[PDB]
Amino acid sequence: SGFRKMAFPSGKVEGCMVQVTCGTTTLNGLWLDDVVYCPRHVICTSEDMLNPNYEDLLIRKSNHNFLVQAGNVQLRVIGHSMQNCVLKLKVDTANPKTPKYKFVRIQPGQTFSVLACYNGSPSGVYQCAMRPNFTIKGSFLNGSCGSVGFNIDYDCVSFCYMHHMELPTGVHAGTDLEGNFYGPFVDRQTAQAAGTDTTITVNVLAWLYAAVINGDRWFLNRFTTTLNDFNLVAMKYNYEPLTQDHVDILGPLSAQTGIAVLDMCASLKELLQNGMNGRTILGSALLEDEFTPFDVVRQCSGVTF
Amino acid sequence: SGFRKMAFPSGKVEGCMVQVTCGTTTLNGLWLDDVVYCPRHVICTSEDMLNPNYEDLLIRKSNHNFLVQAGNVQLRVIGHSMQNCVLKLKVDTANPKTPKYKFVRIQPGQTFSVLACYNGSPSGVYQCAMRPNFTIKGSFLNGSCGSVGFNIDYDCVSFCYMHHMELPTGVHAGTDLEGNFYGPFVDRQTAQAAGTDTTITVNVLAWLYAAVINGDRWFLNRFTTTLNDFNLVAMKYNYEPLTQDHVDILGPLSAQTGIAVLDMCASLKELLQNGMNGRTILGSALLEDEFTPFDVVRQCSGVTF
Ligand SMILES: CC(C)(C)NC(=O)[C@@H](c1cccnc1)N(C(=O)c1ccco1)c1ccc(C(C)(C)C)cc1
Ligand SMILES: CC(C)(C)NC(=O)[C@@H](c1cccnc1)N(C(=O)c1ccco1)c1ccc(C(C)(C)C)cc1
């Protein structure tokens, strides 16, 4: 029993973390096969980051300008190119610790583990979700750029995030491993703001099914509701609209707990309208939305990797 | 910027996780050098766990009754002994992935990372604290016994916990790597209850210093208080008494933020007496106490391993 915010084992990712320096700027890179992936803004200078022209800046850089370090071993960069907002440095040696991996672009509301790194060395791992406004509420300090977020499927690592920027509000922005930013953000020092950060409703529901599975049932009320009526209250509290797919995604937890999805929606509705009256659910005083239906199943079943 | 509940990279611990079976009971073991550590209750049967006499039960077991599996490779048990509530199976091969390690018994209020495992395979990692009642609020399912909690010091792993039991309330109990239970709990199926779970006050203070460092300052009031007066309110809300050592431990955060410790105590006092009025601190609606002063420094500075 018990429900903690939990991340994948990071061993497989640790073996791919290297350091990348260009000029005076140092950050983290991802070393898979004979290619190192890192954010392109490594080539910028503090003055050039107001309006960087990466095409022109990259022209002044040669292979020998990119300093890559795996542990204390230097890698020979024999090629460099730019794919969207990420650099690809080709090295002479393939990473012997390269695991089975894949590059996937996740959807807003999905989760992943982040291995925060500094100078190509891991410092910690935690769990994030892709907010509906395409930011993440990470824990990143300077130099954390180049750290990656990932999911694990038994033996295969699915990379989905690489950190780039911190937004003025304190949130964080980045791209997938193909260099495409999640959201409308760009790698420049300019006024950028994220939209409204709604609540991932389906994730909250899975969290409530998690609570019921762990003994917290005080919030289970006696009503039920309609998917349309529930939505009328969700979209007033800045909640994501629930779809039939969400109801289907939640089916497994509905069958395990024996509580129809629409009944839990009614419980959630009364929680939103009346608050929690100072009580707690799974040790939290807020409605957590950073657990997907799959994460709940994984943690309440025991899926190992 | 940003503050998430974060754990150490688990790669070094992953390479020590093996599976241990005795009879029909399977659980996890820790493989360091040529010894495997696992809870002694692996030798119990479902009937014998009401009042297990481990001395007599262990007498009926030989080396070849303990089945240890590292990956899909079997290890030859050439010796077995009992140290407190943990078994030590001596194997013929030393663990090639054995890192620099140490066995430490942590103090209540301290934190550590847990690598939840099932059948000798890691499933996830999260951060825990040793509650003042000597339980932990883990996420453990059946078979999770034998998983370990640890801290990392650059390159040295300090093991401090090994999971044994789930208590009737839903909390969890275990021992250090020498087999000594944290708290007054015993490895039997009997009526056991933990005492009052107080709040680790010093950890809450470091969390508030963490918030101030991340931009959340709304709770900073205009008063100050005395260490004795603050305690009179803490011990009414079931908070740990603050000592001068706690004030000294918090010195670094007090100097960084420029807020004397006793002033933050006054802020905490008004939060306890009046609640948070539906606001949040670092994304939480409750006062978090599972971050030590050291964890806050590590996360707000960038200490890598
Ligand atoms: C908020 C801002 C002023 C832009 N500071 C940062 O983004 C920090 C940073 C700080 C904390 C977490 N992640 C990045 N930041 C860095 O820390 C950094 C840059 C290179 C290695 O580490 C950073 C990220 C992107 C840029 C440009 C404008 C060139 C794309 C410049 C600096
Ligand atoms: C609450 C209780 C009825 C005792 N169930 C468990 O403790 C589960 C268990 C379940 C969830 C998390 N950790 C342990 N539990 C186990 O899951 C387990 C035992 C062996 C391998 O996995 C367990 C722990 C200790 C004992 C004795 C009494 C022999 C010391 C028996 C079973």
The CA distance from A113 to A163, in Å, is: 12
The pairing of strands B66-70 and B73-75 is antiparallel
| B130 three-class SS | coil
Cα A229 to ligand 2 centroid, rounded to whole Å: 44
* Cα torsion angle, B105, B108, B112, B117, sign: positive
Residues of chain A contacting B12 with CB distance shorter than 8 Å: 11
Pairwise CB contact (< 8 Å): B170 & A215? yes
Q: Which two tokens stand for residue B177?
A: 């790597």
- Distances in Å between the Cα of A114 and the Cα atoms of A13, A124, A144, B183 are 10, 8, 11, 34
Chain centre distance of CA B162: 9
Tokens of B299: 């996360």
Task: Name residue A30's beta-bridge partners.
Answer: A17, A37
User: A267 C-alpha vs ligand 2 centroid, how far in Å?
Assistant: 33
Q: How far is A5 from chain B (nearest CA, A)?
A: 7
* CB-based contact A6 B172, cutoff 8 Å: no
How far does the CA of residue A1 sit from the closest CA of chain B (Å)? 6
> Token pair 């801290």 is at which residue?
B151
Rounded distance between C-alpha atoms, residue A296 and residue B193, angstroms:
28
Q: Is B238 exposed, middle or buried (0-12, 13-18, 19+ CB in 10 A)?
A: exposed
B11-91 matches B201-300 in fold? no
Residue with the two structure tokens 């020092």: A189
Give B211 Cα–ligand 1 centroid separation in angstroms.
Answer: 21
- Six-digit token string for B89: 């199976």
Task: Tokens 């672009």: give the residue.
Answer: A105
Question: d(Cα B100, Cα B97) in Å, to the nearest integer?
Answer: 10
Q: Which of A280, A299, A304, A305 to mutate to test the interface with B (most CBs of B within 10 A)?
A: A304
Residue (of B217, B197, B194) closest to B280 by Cα position: B217
Please list the helix, strand and coil fractions of chain B in percent, rounded to the nearest 5, in that order: 25, 30, 45
Phi, psi of A231 (to 5 degrees): -65, -35
Report residue B96: phi and psi, to 5°.
Answer: -60, -25
Report the interhelical angle of A261-274 vs A201-214 (nearest 10°): 100
Method: X-ray
Residue among B123, B128, B299 minimizing CB distance to A304: B123
Q: How many CA atoms lie within 13 A of B191 on its CB side?
A: 0
CB A115 within 8 A of CB A150: yes
Residue B111, φ and ψ in degrees, nearest 5? -115, 175
- Ligand 2 pocket mutation pick from B57, B139, B145, B167 by most atoms within 8 angstroms of CB: B145
A275 with B278: Cβ contact below 8 A:
yes
Helix (H, G, I), strand (E, B) or coil at B80: strand
- Which residues, at least 6 apart from A3, have a Cβ–Cβ distance to it below 8 Å? A210, A211, A214, A282, A283, A299, A300, B139
The answer to whether the beta carbons of residues B275 and B237 sit under 8 Å apart is no
CB B197 within 8 A of CB B131: yes
Asked if A139 lies within 8 A of B6 by C-beta distance, the reply is yes
**Structure-token match 């040529």, residue found:** B34
Single-letter amino acid code for the residue at B143: G
Q: Is there a catalytic annotation at residue B22? A: no
Check residue A240 and report its DSSP letter: P
B180 CA to middle of ligand 2, Å?
Answer: 17
The answer to whether A133 and A197 are in contact (CB under 8 A) is: yes
Q: Which residue of A has its CA nearest to B167?
A: A1
Whose Cα sits closest to atom 19 in ligand 2? Answer: B143
Judge residue B56's burial from the number of C-beta atoms within 10 Å of its C-beta, 0-12 exposed, 13-18 middle, 19 or more buried: exposed
A7 and B128: CB-CB below 8 Å? no
Cα maximum dimension of chain B: 69
What is the distance in angstroms between the Cα of A128 and the nearest Cα belonging to chain B? 9
Show the ligand 2 pocket: residues with CB < 6 angstroms. A 1; B 25, 27, 41, 44, 49, 140-145, 165-166, 187-189
Chain A hits for B215, CB-CB cut-off 8 Å, are 170
C-alpha distance from B62 to closest chain A C-alpha (Å) = 30
Q: Whose CA is nearest to atom 2 of ligand 2?
A: B166
Q: Homologous superfamily of A201-300 in CATH?
A: main proteinase (3clpro) structure, domain 3 (1.10.1840.10)
Is residue B77 within 8 Å of B89, Cβ to Cβ? yes
Q: Are strands B100-103 and B156-166 parallel, antiparallel or unpaired?
A: parallel
Residues A250, A261 contacting (CB under 8 angstroms): yes
Q: Which residue of A has its CA nearest to B276?
A: A278
b/e per residue A244-258 (b: at least 16 CB within 10 A):
eebbebbebbbeebe
Q: Do A285 and B283 touch (CB under 8 A)?
A: no
Q: Which residues line ligand 1 (CB under 6 A)?
A: A 25, 27, 41, 44, 49, 140-145, 165-166, 187-189; B 1
Q: Sheet containing B66-70: which strands, arranged edge to edge?
A: B73-75, B66-70, B17-22, B25-32, B35-39, B86-91, B77-83
- Pocket probe for ligand 1: among A142, A172, A186, the residue whose CB has the most ligand atoms within 8 Å is A142
Q: Ligand 1 centroid to A175 CA: how many Å?
A: 14
Residues 6+ apart with CB under 8 A from A249: A202, A293
Please, what is the angle between helix B293-301 and helix B201-214, to 10°? 20
What 3-state class would DSSP assign to B193? coil
The Cα–Cα gap between B294 and A95 comes to: 34
Of B187, B175, B168, the residue nearest B147 (C-alpha):
B175
- The whole-angstrom separation of Cα A260 and Cα A221 is 13
CB under 8 Å to B38, separation ≥6 — which residues? Answer: B20, B27, B28, B29, B30, B86, B87, B89, B146
B164: annotated active-site residue: no
d(CA B181, CA B133): 12
Distance A168 CA to ligand 1 centre (A): 11
What type of residue sits at position A227?
A: L
Report which bound ligand comes closest to the CA of B24. 2
C-alpha B248/C-alpha A246 separation (Å) is 51
> Which helix (H) or strand (E) covers residue B12, if one does?
helix B11-14
Resolution value (Å, 1 decimal): 2.4
DSSP notation for A147-181: -EEEEEETTEEEEEEEEEEE-TTS-EEEE-TTS-B
Running DSSP on this structure, what letter comes out for residue A196? -
| Residues in chain B within 8 Å Cβ distance of A305 | 121-123
- Residue A46 burial (10 A CB sphere; 0-12, 13-18, 19+): exposed
Domain A11-91 fold is Thrombin, subunit H (2.40.10)
- d(CA B151, CA A156) in angstroms, rounded, equals 27
DSSP output for A261-294: HHHHHHHHHHHHHH--TT--BTTBSS------HH
The reply to whether residue A122 touches residue B286, judged by beta carbons under 8 angstroms, is no
- Could you count the other beta carbons within 10 Å of the beta carbon of residue A199? 19
CB A29 within 8 A of CB A41: no
Catalytic residue among B16, B38, B128, B145: B145
Residues 6+ apart with CB under 8 A from B199: B237, B238, B239, B240, B287, B289
Name the residue among B123, B171, B286 with its Cβ closest to that of A303: B123
Distance B228 CA to ligand 1 centre (A): 44
Q: Which ligand is nearest to the CA of B145?
A: 2
Residue B2 token pair: 């940003």
Q: Is B288 buried (19+), middle (13-18) or exposed (0-12) by CB count in 10 A?
A: buried
B130 alpha-carbon distance from chain centroid = 5
Could you count the other beta carbons within 10 Å of the beta carbon of residue B12?
A: 22
Distance CA B157, CA B154 (A): 8
Report the catalytic residues of A: 41, 145
Residues of B in contact with A215 (CB under 8 A): 170
Residue A89 in tokens = 């440095």
3-state secondary structure of A124: strand
Asked whether the beta carbons of residue B6 and residue A285 sit closer than 8 angstroms, the reply is: no
**How many other C-beta atoms can be found within 10 angstroms of the C-beta atom of residue B127?**
24
